[PDB]
Design an enzyme around this catalytic site. Structure first.
Site, short mmCIF file in Angstrom:
data_model
loop_
_atom_site.label_atom_id
_atom_site.label_comp_id
_atom_site.label_asym_id
_atom_site.label_seq_id
_atom_site.Cartn_x
_atom_site.Cartn_y
_atom_site.Cartn_z
N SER A 87 0.80 -1.22 0.00
CA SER A 87 0.00 0.00 0.00
C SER A 87 0.85 1.29 0.00
CB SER A 87 -0.95 -0.01 1.20
OG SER A 87 -1.96 -1.00 1.04
N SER A 134 -6.41 3.55 3.78
CA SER A 134 -5.74 2.55 2.95
C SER A 134 -6.75 1.75 2.13
CB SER A 134 -4.87 1.61 3.81
OG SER A 134 -3.75 1.12 3.09
N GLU A 142 -4.60 -3.74 -7.07
CA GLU A 142 -5.00 -4.39 -5.83
C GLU A 142 -5.97 -5.53 -6.12
OE1 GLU A 142 -3.41 -2.07 -2.27
OE2 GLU A 142 -4.18 -4.09 -2.65
N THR A 156 1.19 3.56 5.49
CA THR A 156 1.63 2.20 5.76
C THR A 156 1.46 1.31 4.54
OG1 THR A 156 -0.54 1.66 6.69
CG2 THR A 156 1.18 2.37 8.22
N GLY A 157 2.06 0.13 4.62
CA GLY A 157 1.88 -0.91 3.63
C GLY A 157 1.98 -2.29 4.25
N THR A 158 1.14 -3.22 3.79
CA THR A 158 1.15 -4.58 4.32
C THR A 158 0.78 -5.54 3.20
OG1 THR A 158 0.36 -3.65 6.42
CG2 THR A 158 0.46 -6.04 6.24
#
Length: 265
Positions: free
Chosen positions: A42, A100, A140, A209-211
């Protein structure tokens, strides 16, 4: 000697750590695996909002986008609630950064147009900033699933930190547009336990953030010291040794941010 603590944290969590802090007039650049490729996840949703703002005037944020329930295929806390009413481009930006939202991210990519649903246009935007390394290839939620070693949908702490520098502290955007991007990143709700948790409370923190899979957890941030001195912090991590189902470790990113705060103090 700071590299021995990063390699010590890597041992504790069974992870690979990437950190880069661009050098300023009074501090040397912090590097640890800075030029090694890590997955976007993300993280791209912050320069993507700047890309739409870059190619369109501010009144374009009022254009209403309609979608169907078949288009929601990722974490979308906001888009799940407006399938009947629709969402404007402006609300899609707010949802894509502060929450997000995965569906708002894919719609923004289609607003960029071009081949591959907008991935070519987005990579083209990064090249205009000087980043000849990063690349986005999928949408995504597939962009979180590339195997380790694959160069698709990857960046580096060196590359993404310098891009974020121009967008918040530089002149990549006019002031009125720069204020909207910074304010959305400032009201983020998903980074409370990462970089923000590693810095003291008197430091102002904005982040995205990113996950993903393979235990991937990233956080890019701009921080302000209690005096008002700005820094850019890029912290990225994965856990490829654990397989596709490896859980990400949020405490790793919070710990490494404390190591950076001790050097910048």
């Amino acid at each position: 000697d700071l590299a021995d603590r990063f390699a010590e944290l890597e041992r504790r969590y069974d992870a690979r750590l990437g950190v880069y802090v661009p050098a300023t007039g009074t501090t040397a650049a912090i590097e640890y695996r800075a030029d090694e490729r890590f997955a976007f996840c993300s993280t791209f949703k912050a320069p993507l909002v700047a890309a739409v703002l870059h190619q369109n005037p501010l009144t374009h944020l009022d254009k209403l986008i309609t979608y169907t329930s078949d288009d929601i295929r990722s974490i979308s806390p906001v888009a799940q609630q407006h399938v009947q009413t629709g969402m404007t481009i402006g609300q899609l930006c707010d949802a894509a950064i502060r929450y997000s939202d995965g569906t708002a991210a894919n719609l923004l990519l289609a607003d960029l147009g071009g081949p591959g649903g907008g991935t070519a246009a987005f990579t083209g935007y990064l090249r205009s900033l000087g980043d000849t390394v990063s690349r986005l290839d999928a949408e995504e939620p597939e962009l979180n699933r590339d195997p380790p070693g694959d160069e698709r949908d990857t960046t580096t702490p060196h590359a993404i930190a310098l891009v974020l520098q121009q967008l918040v502290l530089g002149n990549a955007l006019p002031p009125d547009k720069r204020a909207l991007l910074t304010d959305w990143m400032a009201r983020n709700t998903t980074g409370a336990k990462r970089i923000r948790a590693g810095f003291p409370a008197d430091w102002k923190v904005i982040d995205k953030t990113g996950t993903g899979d393979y235990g991937r957890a990233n956080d890019i941030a701009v921080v302000w010291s209690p005096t008002g001195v700005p820094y850019v912090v890029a912290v990225m991590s994965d856990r490829a040794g654990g397989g596709y189902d490896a859980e990400p470790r949020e405490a790793l990113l919070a710990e490494a941010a404390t190591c950076v705060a001790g050097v910048l103090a």
